[PDB]
Design a protein around this ligand. Structure first.
Ligand SMILES: c1cc(-c2ccc(CNC3CCCCC3)cc2)cs1
Length: 188
């Protein structure tokens, strides 16, 4: 077959009922994730190839970066709660991996302040139980598949993208194959 279980994707041994249609996991510490976001724009190109109004979900993980990694999962919860993902994703990646100016929870907060989120609003969200529940949701979703590597994408709780089996000579062709694979999986 043109798409084969074991090649462009794998099938979850223990499938996850009731999971988001398209679910991505990343870490701001993760070098491929940096590329997926700023260089390849994987999430954007998958959304364009899926039906309008499809639920795409993107969650941060704790297992890279120790204390700061957990702070970033909580900061990503704040980003989701306020709806400012599109404003902080690039500066968070660059602060962790490019300039390495993010060394503390305060430095993460600075990124939100610079992006125009008011300090009182960031702090209220950071301390909110709505954000605690978003953190729990991110952890539970990752736990549902004993996740140990990012970046990772899951389709309907059943299939995991396998980018290792895609040609990487041409960035655009790679992105297109990845997105076309997500579309194929979503239609299974
Ligand atoms: C979990 C996902 C990966 C992975 C494997 C391969 C790629 C593709 N690298 C891109 C391919 C296009 C050229 C630029 C770099 C991206 C991520 C390694 S572990």
């Amino acid at each position: 077959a043109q798409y084969e279980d074991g090649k462009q994707y794998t099938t979850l041994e223990k499938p996850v009922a009731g999971a988001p249609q398209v679910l991505e996991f990343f870490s701001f510490f993760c070098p491929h994730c940096y590329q997926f976001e700023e260089v390849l724009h994987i999430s954007d190109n998958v959304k364009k190839k899926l039906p309008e109004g499809v639920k795409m979900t993107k969650y941060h993980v704790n297992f890279m970066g120790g204390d700061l990694g957990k702070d970033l999962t909580q900061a990503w919860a704040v980003a989701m709660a306020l709806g400012v993902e599109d404003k902080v994703t690039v500066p968070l990646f660059e602060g962790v991996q490019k300039t390495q100016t993010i060394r503390s929870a305060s430095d993460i907060r600075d990124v939100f302040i610079n992006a125009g989120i008011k300090g009182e609003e960031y702090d209220a969200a950071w301390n909110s139980f709505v954000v605690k529940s978003l953190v729990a949701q991110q952890e539970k979703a990752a736990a549902d598949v004993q996740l140990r590597g990012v970046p990772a994408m899951f389709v309907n709780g059943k299939y995991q993208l396998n980018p290792q089996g895609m040609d990487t000579s041409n960035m655009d062709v790679f992105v297109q194959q990845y997105a076309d694979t997500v579309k194929y999986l979503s239609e299974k």
